Amino acid sequence: MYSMPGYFQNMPTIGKELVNPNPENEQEIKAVESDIHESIKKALDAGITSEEKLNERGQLSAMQRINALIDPGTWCPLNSLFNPENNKFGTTNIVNGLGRVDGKWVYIVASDNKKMAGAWVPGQAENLIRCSDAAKMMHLPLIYLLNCSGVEFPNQDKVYPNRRGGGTPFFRNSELNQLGIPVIVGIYGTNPAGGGYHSISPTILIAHQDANMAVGKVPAPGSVPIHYDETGFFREVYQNDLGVIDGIKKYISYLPAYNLEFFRVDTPKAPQLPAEDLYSIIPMNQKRPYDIYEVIARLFDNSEFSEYKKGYGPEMVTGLAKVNGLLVGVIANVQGLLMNYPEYKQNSVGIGGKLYRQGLIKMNEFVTLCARDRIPLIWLQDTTGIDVGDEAEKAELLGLGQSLIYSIENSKLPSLEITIRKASAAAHYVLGGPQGNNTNVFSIGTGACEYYVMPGETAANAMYSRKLQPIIGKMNDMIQMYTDKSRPKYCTEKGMVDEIVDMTEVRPYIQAFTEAAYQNPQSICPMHQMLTPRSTREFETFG
Amino acid sequence: MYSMPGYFQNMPTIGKELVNPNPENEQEIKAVESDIHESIKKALDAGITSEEKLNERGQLSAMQRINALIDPGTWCPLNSLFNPENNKFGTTNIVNGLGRVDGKWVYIVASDNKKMAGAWVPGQAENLIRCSDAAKMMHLPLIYLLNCSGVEFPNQDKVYPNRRGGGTPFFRNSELNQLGIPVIVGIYGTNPAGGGYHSISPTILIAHQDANMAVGKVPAPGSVPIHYDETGFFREVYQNDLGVIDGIKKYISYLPAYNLEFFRVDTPKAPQLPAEDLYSIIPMNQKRPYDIYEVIARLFDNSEFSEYKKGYGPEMVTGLAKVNGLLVGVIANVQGLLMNYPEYKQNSVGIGGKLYRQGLIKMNEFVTLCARDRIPLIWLQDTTGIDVGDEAEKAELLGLGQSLIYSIENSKLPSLEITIRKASAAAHYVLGGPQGNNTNVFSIGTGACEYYVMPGETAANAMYSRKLQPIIGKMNDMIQMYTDKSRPKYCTEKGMVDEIVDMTEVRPYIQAFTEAAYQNPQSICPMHQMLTPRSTREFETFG
Amino acid sequence: MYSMPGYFQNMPTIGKELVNPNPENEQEIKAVESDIHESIKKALDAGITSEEKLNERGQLSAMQRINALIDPGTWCPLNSLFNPENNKFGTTNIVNGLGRVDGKWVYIVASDNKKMAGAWVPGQAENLIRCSDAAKMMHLPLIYLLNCSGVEFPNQDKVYPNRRGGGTPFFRNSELNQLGIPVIVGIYGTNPAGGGYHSISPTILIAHQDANMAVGKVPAPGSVPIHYDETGFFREVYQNDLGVIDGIKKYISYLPAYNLEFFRVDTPKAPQLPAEDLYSIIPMNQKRPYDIYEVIARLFDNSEFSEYKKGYGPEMVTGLAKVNGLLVGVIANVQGLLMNYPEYKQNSVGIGGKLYRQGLIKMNEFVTLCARDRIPLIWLQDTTGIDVGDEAEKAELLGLGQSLIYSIENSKLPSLEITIRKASAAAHYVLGGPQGNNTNVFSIGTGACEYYVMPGETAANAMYSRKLQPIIGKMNDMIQMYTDKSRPKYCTEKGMVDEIVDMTEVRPYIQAFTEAAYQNPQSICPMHQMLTPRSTREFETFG
Q: What is the dihedral of CA A195, A201, A203, A205, to 10 degrees?
A: 30
Residue B230 and residue B240 in one domain: yes
Task: Report the distance separating Cα C25 and Cα C268, nearest Å.
Answer: 31
Residue C240 and residue C268 in one domain: no
Last residue of a domain, one of C257, C284, C317: C257
> Cα–chain-centroid distance for residue B274?
23
**How close is the nearest chain B Cα to the Cα of A160, in Å?**
6
SS3 B198: helix
Set of chain B residues whose Cβ sits within 8 Å of the Cβ of A408: 171, 174
Task: Report the distance separating Cα B432 and Cα B368, nearest Å.
Answer: 13
Q: How many residues does chain A have?
A: 543
Residue B225 and residue B299 in one domain: no
Query: CA angle, corner C191, sides to C187 and C192, nearest 5?
Result: 155
**Of B162, B178, B496, Cβ closest to residue A409:** B178
| CATH code: domain of residue B44 | 1.20.5.680
Task: Report the distance separating Cα A14 and Cα C306, nearest Å.
Answer: 39
Q: Which of A153, A424, A437 to mutate to test the interface with B (most CBs of B within 10 A)?
A: A153
**How close is the nearest chain B Cα to the Cα of A503, in Å?**
22
* Helix (H) or strand (E) run with residue A171 in it: helix A168-178
Task: Report the distance separating Cα C224 and Cα C235, nearest Å.
Answer: 10
Which residues are within 8 A (CB) of A117 and not within 5 positions of it... i.e. 6 or more apart?
Answer: A111, A147, A148, A149, A189, A190
Residue A347 and residue A486 in one domain: yes
Contact A488/A36 with Cβ under 8 angstroms? yes
Secondary structure of A279-318 as H, E, C letters: HHHCCCCCCCCCCHHHHHHHHCHHHECEECCCCCCCCEEE
Task: Report the distance separating Cα B335 and Cα B286, nearest Å.
Answer: 11
Set of chain A residues whose Cβ sits within 8 Å of the Cβ of B402: 170, 174, 197, 200-201
Contact B463/B447 with Cβ under 8 angstroms? no
Contact B442/B498 with Cβ under 8 angstroms? yes
**How close is the nearest chain B Cα to the Cα of C362, in Å?**
25
C385-386 and C354-355 as β-strands: parallel, antiparallel, unpaired? parallel
Task: Report the distance separating Cα C353 and Cα C372, nearest Å.
Answer: 27
AA identity, residue C249? K
C400 in contact with A at a CB cutoff of 8 Å? Answer: yes
**How close is the nearest chain B Cα to the Cα of A488, in Å?**
13
Set of chain C residues whose Cβ sits within 8 Å of the Cβ of A312: 538, 542
| Annotated catalytic residue within C94, C151, C295, C297 | C151
Residues 433-492 of B with CB under 8 A from C: none
Residue of B nearest to C374 (CA): B178
**How close is the nearest chain C Cα to the Cα of A530, in Å?**
7
Contact B375/A204 with Cβ under 8 angstroms? no
Cis status, amide bond into A169, omega within 30 of 0: no
AA identity, residue A244? V
SS3 B243: helix
Query: Does A386 participate in catalysis according to the annotation?
Result: yes
Q: Which of A400, A408, A412, A529 to mutate to test the interface with C (most CBs of C within 10 A)?
A: A529
Number of Cα atoms under 13 Å in the Cβ half of residue B354: 19
Name chain C's partners: 3 or more CB pairs within 8 A: A, B
Secondary structure of A415-457 as H, E, C letters: EEEEECCEEEHHHHHHCCCCCCCCCEEEEEECCCCEEECCCHH
* Helix (H) or strand (E) run with residue B212 in it: strand B212-214
Task: Report the distance separating Cα C271 and Cα C298, nearest Å.
Answer: 5
Task: Report the distance separating Cα A315 and Cα A339, nearest Å.
Answer: 11
Residue C163 and residue C264 in one domain: no
* Helix (H) or strand (E) run with residue A177 in it: helix A168-178
* Helix (H) or strand (E) run with residue A245 in it: helix A241-253
Please list the active-site residues of B. 151, 194, 386, 426
Q: How many residues does chain C have?
A: 543
SS3 C394: helix
Contact B74/B107 with Cβ under 8 angstroms? no
Question: How crowded is residue A288: how many other Cβ atoms within 10 Å of its Cβ?
Answer: 13
Over the range A456-485, which residues count as b (16 or more CB within 10 Å of their CB) and which as e?
bebbbeeeeeeeeeeeeeebeebbebbeeb
Over the range A340-349, which residues count as b (16 or more CB within 10 Å of their CB) and which as e?
ebbbbbeeee
Residue C443 and residue C511 in one domain: yes
Task: Report the distance separating Cα A523 and Cα A530, nearest Å.
Answer: 13
SS3 C207: strand
Task: Report the distance separating Cα C219 and Cα C221, nearest Å.
Answer: 6
β strands within A112-232, DSSP E: 142-146, 183-187, 190-192, 204-208, 212-214
A411 in contact with C at a CB cutoff of 8 Å? Answer: no
The number of helix segments (H) and strand segments (E) in chain C equals: 21, 22
Q: How many residues does chain B have?
A: 543
Task: Report the distance separating Cα A231 and Cα B395, nearest Å.
Answer: 8
AA identity, residue B207? A
CB contact under 8 A, A178 and B410: yes
C10 in contact with B at a CB cutoff of 8 Å? Answer: no
C246 in contact with A at a CB cutoff of 8 Å? Answer: no
Question: How crowded is residue B203: how many other Cβ atoms within 10 Å of its Cβ?
Answer: 26
> Cα–chain-centroid distance for residue A241?
29
Task: Report the distance separating Cα B456 and Cα B450, nearest Å.
Answer: 11
B10 in contact with C at a CB cutoff of 8 Å? Answer: no
Cis status, amide bond into B141, omega within 30 of 0: no
Task: Report the distance separating Cα B509 and Cα B125, nearest Å.
Answer: 24
Longest dimension (CA), chain B: 85
Residue B229 and residue B298 in one domain: no
Over the range B92-110, which residues count as b (16 or more CB within 10 Å of their CB) and which as e?
bbbbbbbbbbeebbbbbbb
Task: Report the distance separating Cα B398 and Cα B430, nearest Å.
Answer: 11
Which residues are within 8 A (CB) of A39 and not within 5 positions of it... i.e. 6 or more apart?
Answer: A81, A90, A489
From first CA to last CA, the distance across chain B in angstroms is 32
> Cα–chain-centroid distance for residue A462?
33
Task: Report the distance separating Cα A443 and Cα A492, nearest Å.
Answer: 10
Residue B320 and residue B417 in one domain: yes
Residue A322 and residue A219 in one domain: no
Question: How crowded is residue B543: how many other Cβ atoms within 10 Å of its Cβ?
Answer: 6
Of B99, B371, B215, the closest CA to residue A386 belongs to: B215
Over the range C47-75, which residues count as b (16 or more CB within 10 Å of their CB) and which as e?
bebebeebeeeebbbbbbbbebbbeeebb
Set of chain B residues whose Cβ sits within 8 Å of the Cβ of C5: 232
AA identity, residue B297? A
Q: Which of C529, C530, C531, C537 to mutate to test the interface with B (most CBs of B within 10 A)?
A: C529
> Cα–chain-centroid distance for residue A4?
31
AA identity, residue C99? G
Longest dimension (CA), chain C: 85
Number of Cα atoms under 13 Å in the Cβ half of residue C331: 31
> Cα–chain-centroid distance for residue A251?
26
DSSP C297-310: HHHSGGGB-EESST
Q: Is the dihedral of CA B370, B375, B379, B380 positive or negative?
A: negative
Q: What total number of domains does chain B contain? A: 3
β strands within B264-389, DSSP E: 306-307, 316-323, 326-333, 337-339, 349-351, 354-355, 377-381, 385-386
Task: Report the distance separating Cα B510 and Cα B499, nearest Å.
Answer: 13
**Of A171, A215, A433, Cβ closest to residue B436:** A171
- Strands laid side by side in the A415-419 sheet: A306-307, A316-323, A326-333, A377-381, A415-419, A440-445, A499-500
Task: Report the distance separating Cα B102 and Cα B107, nearest Å.
Answer: 14
Of B40, B104, B101, the closest CA to residue B68 belongs to: B101
B7 in contact with C at a CB cutoff of 8 Å? Answer: yes
Q: Which of C365, C374, C530 to mutate to test the interface with A (most CBs of A within 10 A)?
A: C365
Over the range A74-85, which residues count as b (16 or more CB within 10 Å of their CB) and which as e?
bbbbbbbbbbbe
Of A507, A367, A489, A364, the closest CA to residue A440 belongs to: A367
Residue C91 and residue C36 in one domain: no
**How close is the nearest chain B Cα to the Cα of A328, in Å?**
23
**Of B7, B180, B251, Cβ closest to residue C521:** B180
Task: Report the distance separating Cα B10 and Cα B8, nearest Å.
Answer: 7
Task: Report the distance separating Cα B392 and Cα B343, nearest Å.
Answer: 10
CB contact under 8 A, B523 and C179: yes
Contact B331/B380 with Cβ under 8 angstroms? yes
Task: Report the distance separating Cα B12 and Cα B324, nearest Å.
Answer: 17
SS3 C115: coil
Task: Report the distance separating Cα B242 and Cα C8, nearest Å.
Answer: 28
Task: Report the distance separating Cα A69 and Cα A75, nearest Å.
Answer: 10
Question: How crowded is residue A38: how many other Cβ atoms within 10 Å of its Cβ?
Answer: 11
β strands within C239-391, DSSP E: 306-307, 316-323, 326-333, 337-339, 349-351, 354-355, 377-381, 385-386
C49 in contact with A at a CB cutoff of 8 Å? Answer: no
Residue A64 and residue A44 in one domain: no
Phi, psi of C307 (to 5 degrees): -75, 135
Cis status, amide bond into A342, omega within 30 of 0: yes
Contact B132/B442 with Cβ under 8 angstroms? no
> Cα–chain-centroid distance for residue A388?
29
Measured CA distances, A432 to A38, A413, A415, B206 (Å): 30, 11, 7, 28
Set of chain A residues whose Cβ sits within 8 Å of the Cβ of B461: none
Specify the DSSP class assigned to residue C23: H
- Strands laid side by side in the C316-323 sheet: C306-307, C316-323, C326-333, C377-381, C415-419, C440-445, C499-500
AA identity, residue B101? V
Measured CA distances, A326 to A99, A264, A265, A531, C238 (Å): 19, 5, 6, 16, 66
Burial of A242 (0-12, 13-18, 19+ CB in 10 A): middle
A230 in contact with B at a CB cutoff of 8 Å? Answer: yes
Of B367, A208, A20, B227, the closest CA to residue C3 belongs to: B227
Burial of B242 (0-12, 13-18, 19+ CB in 10 A): middle
| Annotated catalytic residue within A40, A106, A108, A151 | A151
Q: Which residues constitute the domain of residue B305?
A: 258-543
CB contact under 8 A, C523 and B258: no
| CATH code: domain of residue A456 | 3.90.226.10
Residue of C nearest to A536 (CA): C361
Residue C232 and residue C371 in one domain: no
Set of chain C residues whose Cβ sits within 8 Å of the Cβ of A366: none
From first CA to last CA, the distance across chain C in angstroms is 32
A212-214 and C190-192 as β-strands: parallel, antiparallel, unpaired? unpaired
CB contact under 8 A, C528 and B259: no
> Cα–chain-centroid distance for residue C432?
12
DSSP B74-131: --EEESTT--TT--TTSS-SEEEEEEEETTEEEEEEEE-TTSGGG-B-TTHHHHHHHH
Task: Report the distance separating Cα B171 and Cα A437, nearest Å.
Answer: 8
| % helix, strand, coil for chain B, step of 5 | 40, 20, 40
Burial of B48 (0-12, 13-18, 19+ CB in 10 A): exposed
> Cα–chain-centroid distance for residue B371?
19
Report the DSSP beta bridge partners of residue B377.
B329, B415
Measured CA distances, B459 to A57, B422, B475 (Å): 27, 16, 8
Last residue of a domain, one of A202, A224, A257: A257
β strands within A282-408, DSSP E: 306-307, 316-323, 326-333, 337-339, 349-351, 354-355, 377-381, 385-386
Contact A273/A298 with Cβ under 8 angstroms? yes
CB contact under 8 A, B426 and A153: no
**Of C372, C534, C543, Cβ closest to residue A361:** C534
Contact B450/B286 with Cβ under 8 angstroms? yes
Residues 146-175 of C with CB under 8 A from B: 174
CB contact under 8 A, B437 and A402: no
**How close is the nearest chain C Cα to the Cα of B524, in Å?**
5
Contact A420/A394 with Cβ under 8 angstroms? no
Of C543, C524, C180, C518, the closest CA to residue C378 belongs to: C518
Residue of C nearest to B184 (CA): C526
Overall resolution, Å: 2.4
Last residue of a domain, one of C58, C82, C97: C58
SS3 A183: strand
AA identity, residue C361? I
Secondary structure of A453-486 as H, E, C letters: CCCHHHHHHHHHCCCCCHHHHHHHHHHHHHHHCC
**Of B177, B204, B255, Cβ closest to residue C525:** B177
Contact B88/B239 with Cβ under 8 angstroms? no
A385-386 and A76-78 as β-strands: parallel, antiparallel, unpaired? unpaired
